[PDB]
Amino acid sequence: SLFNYIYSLMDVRGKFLFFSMLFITSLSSIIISISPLILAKITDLLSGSLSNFSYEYLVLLACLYMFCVISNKASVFLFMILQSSLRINMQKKMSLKYLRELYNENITNLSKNNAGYTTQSLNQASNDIYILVRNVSQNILSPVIQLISTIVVVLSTKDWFSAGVFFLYILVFVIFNTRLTGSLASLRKHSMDITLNSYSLLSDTVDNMIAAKKNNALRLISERYEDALTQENNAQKKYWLLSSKVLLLNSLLAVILFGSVFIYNILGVLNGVVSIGHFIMITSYIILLSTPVENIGALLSEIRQSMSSLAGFIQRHAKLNLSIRELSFSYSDDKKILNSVSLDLFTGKMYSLTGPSGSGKSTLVKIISGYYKNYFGDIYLNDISLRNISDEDLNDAIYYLTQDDYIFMDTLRFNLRLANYDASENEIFKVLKLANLSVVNNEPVSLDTHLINRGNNYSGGQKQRISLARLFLRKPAIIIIDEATSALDYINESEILSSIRTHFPDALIINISHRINLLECSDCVYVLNEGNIVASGHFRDLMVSNEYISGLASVTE
Amino acid sequence: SLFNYIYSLMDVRGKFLFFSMLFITSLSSIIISISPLILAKITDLLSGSLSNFSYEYLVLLACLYMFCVISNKASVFLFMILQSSLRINMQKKMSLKYLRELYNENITNLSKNNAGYTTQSLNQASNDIYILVRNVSQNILSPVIQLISTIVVVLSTKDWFSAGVFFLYILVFVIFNTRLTGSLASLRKHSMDITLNSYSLLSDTVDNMIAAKKNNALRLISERYEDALTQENNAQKKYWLLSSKVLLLNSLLAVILFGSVFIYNILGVLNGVVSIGHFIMITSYIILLSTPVENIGALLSEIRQSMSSLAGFIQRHAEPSIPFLNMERKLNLSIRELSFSYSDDKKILNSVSLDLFTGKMYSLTGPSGSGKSTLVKIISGYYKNYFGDIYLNDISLRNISDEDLNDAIYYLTQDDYIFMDTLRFNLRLANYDASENEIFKVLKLANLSVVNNEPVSLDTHLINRGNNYSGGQKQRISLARLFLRKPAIIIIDEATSALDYINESEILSSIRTHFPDALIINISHRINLLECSDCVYVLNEGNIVASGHFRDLMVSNEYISGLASVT
Ligand SMILES: Nc1ncnc2c1ncn2[C@@H]1O[C@H](COP(=O)(O)OP(=O)(O)NP(=O)(O)O)[C@@H](O)[C@H]1O
Ligand SMILES: Nc1ncnc2c1ncn2[C@@H]1O[C@H](COP(=O)(O)OP(=O)(O)NP(=O)(O)O)[C@@H](O)[C@H]1O
Ligand SMILES: [Mg+2]
Ligand SMILES: [Mg+2]
């Protein structure tokens, strides 16, 4: 499942580059596994006679050893060039898949993480893929070829002690390291998660740096980050201590077992039972074997470490008449936000909704917008349930102007093209007049105006006008205005709301406001209090009967 | 400049670990540079003698070669363990320095770049320090010892051709690689900057993902990112192609010059002019020299690459107050001919003259372009590049420190800045030494003591941008922060807009009662807030068009007449 995802990230070019890395590393392993027999033939030849044909043969063997070294050094440079070229090839498809994965996630899941967390999650996952790609193509065929060749030729020389101890080392190595690889993977995954938590805390402090600066308390903001970095260091030191203990125990086992083979051949050469050519062949195999053993040690650890951390990443990723009947909602089971709210709204009519901050005006309208789907009750559109409507169809029929502004760090043209991609440059400027954003500071507005992070190069009211302009480019049946014109003066506010009603005449408009101006101009007003509709009717009728609406009208005087 | 900054990042433990890495790498280089002489002596002892060589001396030499190999393999493992331990040691001090560097920057410089850019900037800079630490500890003493040793012993054997060509190789290598290292550093820095630009665009799409989702246009958001990644790939391929061309030219030079030395000693051994012991010593030197040459090639490139990219980071982030000034209890604001521009193209505020006094509530209004927020941001000390003068009790704003100004003036911003932490953390931002009972008293003052008919716990975790609380409930957190501070001037820039008439009027009354001797400046487009004030100021197109009582301005002023038409 996880390997399938990695194989899908590479294109036709990526497949070739991956198999070229696997081929080059396998071919190099065959060539270098011949080297110790060449040294053995050089060594014995030196002890013997030194005829004309013995010097010519020595020179030939010296060239073969040189070719063996050159082939291995050219293969590590070719693996490097192909590996980096494959990194470039895979990263574009990996990043685009991640962005499209985030687009398909629900609002609740999106809001629980952080951008700094999100960008660093891609960094950790992309690294794990790079690690896994390297370990297959490089640490599979290459070490097996070299370990098999070593045992085969040492068995051929009838040296049962060397071939036996060499086999014994691989057998103990694989058993011991796989018995501890699970502990290394857990400690590394736990460290990487704390690392993500440290990035979210840094990202959070930088986004609210203006608030931290004006309230001072550099002590408070830095202590929070210092405690996150201390948790990060302790988790890193735990992994460091275990991995270094494994490296030292694996090194100590190598000097005992391979050292025993070295002393056995030393005593063999002294007593006259073993030849110098065979002794040099054995010592050169001890040195040769270190590289494949290092690759097996990395293969076992990096596959269990990167597979564990990449498993966590994949898991994390995995004419309209509105009729709301007995709608009940809770964010957490502990506390009830909306209880049995029953409404019946009709096309072409402008409705108003008000109440205190805890009543749940935004929640109710977010459920109509399809932000949250875990609700008890029924919401219909022309006798069609919201549950039976797709998110794409609901986004076309209903347009929700959020309480908070979401301005993209790009041109004004990009911010308006978010509402409609096929919009002509003349059509976008027509929408600017409708949003009263055609002229700013007695100079015309250009669509190429670059807007900085959070659109803070524009005033609060000017940001609201960008969001209102996006509405004019869409074609909805239901329009929801959740305190979207609060930072506008009475002139701009009334001018834009009239433009919404004229351009969208057959539109069900739901307006959330705490001001008399917006409540008076509506067909019907609904008072939501502690999650339930306490009062309903015309604004003038509510002024007398309802206490909350009455007190709102007396603020004008 | 740069190296001093890196040396300061290491503590007493970091200094030891760094010099241990430098020592272990240098010691190992001496030991391994002996190895080709041991092989020469093995070869000579066997060569010629028909098994009449001393076996005891052969065994001793075989053990010395084995020790030389083991010492070198133990040194790379010790370097690894010390390097990773030094990475852990240095990263905490590096990250804390970066956060405190960002705190001391001005608002204009912080608004230039997104948090995704900020987090990735630390990633790039921390990597560059790691690279530079490795090159100075492992790529300086180790290759010089090995290159000097090789030339010295080959000169000792009177082999002027091998010693000459080996010197020729190093001389051509250093000249050719340093003549291209400038091109590599430029291409890599340009690639790393495009990488930061890609991270800012991803971070920007995720922060506005809800807006992208509800408007659809996955096409638009993905195409923006696809074009950023294509710019990233093209910049990477440019560097890849040049570095691989350098590697192939350096490799081809090595097979020509070191191949010439190999053939010369081959013909020397065939003709009988050179010994086999000397031939093996020369070939083993050819093999040995690859590792130091690789380290010199890395030293030249990685210092010019990492120093170039780390210079940009230091430049962007790195680039007269009264000592222990005692601010008065009661402060009067005197703004004389204040003029301000964000960019030289247009004037935002022109010659605005005000005189506000302690204990009095003033109102400020006008259109969106007039600059109410900008004017009050300048009083708050957001921007310092202004023409004119602003005084506090005949003390210039320029002569007041940022910490003293933040104590005397509290500015309630138009936008809410809620920290992703507990409610206690969000309120302790205003005062660190606040008692748990004192913080709950402030919650009543902000009408945030009870929510949803249940008492508020100070341990309530607030999510990203505090979006687990309503828009009005977020404003109450900001208002609660005011009650924990002790200011002389309070500025309310549309800070109660998302509150109903009950909460709004209840909180504003609580502000005036708790801070009686406070100069209050209120920005609003609503009649409710303008009527309740001692004096109203109309700002239009960057200048004060009208000043006086609300009733006097109601008739005369055009802007306030447009507001009065509600009923
Ligand atoms: N994401 C969330 N998780 C948990 N509780 C939430 C969340 N969003 C809102 N609430 C709570 O739900 C209640 C209603 O929130 P909301 O619907 O935003 O308020 P509102 O009635 O629109 N008020 P206002 O926007 O301030 O004018 C409050 O008690 C909030 O704290
Ligand atoms: N950072 C900035 N860079 C450039 N122009 C800016 C910046 N901030 C504000 N402006 C412009 O300066 C003018 C005044 O901005 P600002 O001080 O926020 O407005 P305001 O008078 O508070 N209006 P409003 O908040 O909408 O009721 C407008 O033309 C803005 O576009
Ligand atoms: Mg709301
Ligand atoms: Mg403003």
Author numbering:
A (entry chain A): 8 to 325, 342 to 580
B (entry chain B): 8 to 326, 332 to 579
Q: What does the article say, verbatim?
A:
In this study, we report the determination of diverse protein structures by experimental phasing techniques carried out at long wavelengths on beamline I23 at Diamond Light Source using S, Ca, K, Cl, V, I, Cd, and P as anomalous scatterers. Native-SAD uses light atoms naturally occurring in proteins or bound to proteins. We demonstrate that long-wavelength native-SAD has become a very compelling technique, where a low multiplicity dataset from a single crystal can be sufficient for successful structure determination, making it a general vehicle of choice for experimental phasing.
In contrast, AcrB, McjD, and A2AR diffracted to only modest resolution: 3.4, 2.8, and 2.9 Å respectively (with corresponding molecular weights of 115, 65, and 50 kDa).
